[PDB]
Design a protein around this ligand. Sequence first.
Ligand SMILES: CO/N=C(\C(=O)N[C@H](C(=O)O)[C@@H]1N=C(C(=O)O)[C@@H](COC(N)=O)CS1)c1ccco1
Ligand SMILES: CO/N=C(\C(=O)N[C@H](C(=O)O)[C@@H]1N=C(C(=O)O)[C@@H](COC(N)=O)CS1)c1ccco1
Ligand SMILES: [Zn+2]
Ligand SMILES: [Zn+2]
Ligand SMILES: [Zn+2]
Ligand SMILES: [Zn+2]
Lengths: 239, 230
Amino acid sequence: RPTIGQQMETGDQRFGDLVFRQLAPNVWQHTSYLDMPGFGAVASNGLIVRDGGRVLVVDTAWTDDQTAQILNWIKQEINLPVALAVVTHAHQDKMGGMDALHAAGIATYANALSNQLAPQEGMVAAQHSLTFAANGWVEPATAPNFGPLKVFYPGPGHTSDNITVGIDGTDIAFGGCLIKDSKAKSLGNLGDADTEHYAASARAFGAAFPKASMIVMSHSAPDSRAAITHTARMADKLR
Amino acid sequence: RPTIDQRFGDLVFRQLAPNVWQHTSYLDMFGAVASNGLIVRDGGRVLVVDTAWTDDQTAQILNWIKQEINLPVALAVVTHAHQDKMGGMDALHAAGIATYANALSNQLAPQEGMVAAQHSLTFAANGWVEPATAPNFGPLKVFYPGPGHTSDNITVGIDGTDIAFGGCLIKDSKAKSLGNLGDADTEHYAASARAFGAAFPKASMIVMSHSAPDSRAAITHTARMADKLR
Ligand SMILES: CO/N=C(\C(=O)N[C@H](C(=O)O)[C@@H]1N=C(C(=O)O)[C@@H](COC(N)=O)CS1)c1ccco1
Ligand SMILES: CO/N=C(\C(=O)N[C@H](C(=O)O)[C@@H]1N=C(C(=O)O)[C@@H](COC(N)=O)CS1)c1ccco1
Ligand SMILES: [Zn+2]
Ligand SMILES: [Zn+2]
Ligand SMILES: [Zn+2]
Ligand SMILES: [Zn+2]
């Protein structure tokens, strides 16, 4: 029962300290929890995607130990090798577990800017850098063999480096910490945010994946496209 | 722009009724966390419900009161032993303000990192404050609804207004969860939320610690979320 983040409901599997929810035949959401003394636990969500005989991960958990638990869940429930992970910006909820991925021998990818920022936050860069076109689409040569992961940089918003991921062959897109849920009272932590460009970036994510009906995000349960439009409307108020 | 109106220094004030204002203060951690309390004008004096998160913020509340109302602050009632409600006790005491809390809040206070109030409120089995422990409370009607967000949580209605204050017990009607349940009584929470509603059956404006004022649907929704904890 986290203080911040969705609660457990039917469909969820508790595994160690984490929760897993199947979203599609080949897509699961991982959820891990950071305890803040005096405040309680904060949930963060990422994705696990099966692509034939391999698995792809989006985001670490908050810590190495929690991230190793994700890998243990994958071993138990899927029993296929993890080919690569993509992490969606240089904050602890998304990149706190890089060492566990590296120890397991998993190739890691992040926005070049996230890799440049990571050490400034005490964290470990991904081993490979993604770069983007002027319209936000990832440069394909930087994202080799990504299978159904369609990476899109929507512009600065929650952070300047935030990226998003569509899951090709499904109706799911992942907004990470850029997108908040359709009932959210606020845009979360704006400490590293670009308040001028946020609204346009949220809308750009929606336009990049115009047919995604299930929007997955870091700190609330999967939602409708109203998460994207509500996020953009909250962001409009920041300018 | 907290992670979780009149600006005055680091605080925000909102008038809810001719003699009632909501105070809001922010704890920067992750980002800033808002907490709300109340300021009430009665009979030439001001009564405060809850401190801000810190002594300095609470001193700013007293300064706002000086500038906007300019009447003596007679007493404060604080609604449980957590930082959002009791973090500023020293500032109230320095200013000569008499402070009141549930006896249990005062006993938990040091263990929770808080300075105890000067006076202890006690309660009947039905939840209503024992009158002799709450002298000169004016329109404040203090009710202990049972364990919920914490075992010590109390609530406050304002007679002659449409307002009741649920503090951290009550969450808003659109809330996804009950906030921090680390110190909560998950078995009794739903009954306690319902007891608050029944204690203040007339109140149409429900004020709470971590959301803007809401309708009575906040009570109903909070109880229903709490039913699920059992
Ligand atoms: C380097 O990052 N350090 C983190 C961290 O990852 N914080 C992130 C952030 O602040 O952007 C998390 N992400 C957030 C987000 O809006 O995406 C918020 C979520 O917290 C809530 N309740 O919104 C704060 S917690 C941290 C320290 C303590 C809690 O989080
Ligand atoms: C002793 O209290 N220490 C506090 C504190 O006041 N915490 C309170 C609590 O945990 O109940 C606050 N109250 C809460 C509540 O549900 O009433 C939550 C609100 O935080 C959120 N966004 O739910 C966490 S912050 C604290 C320490 C560090 C941050 O807050
Ligand atoms: Zn972030
Ligand atoms: Zn985040
Ligand atoms: Zn509390
Ligand atoms: Zn609280």
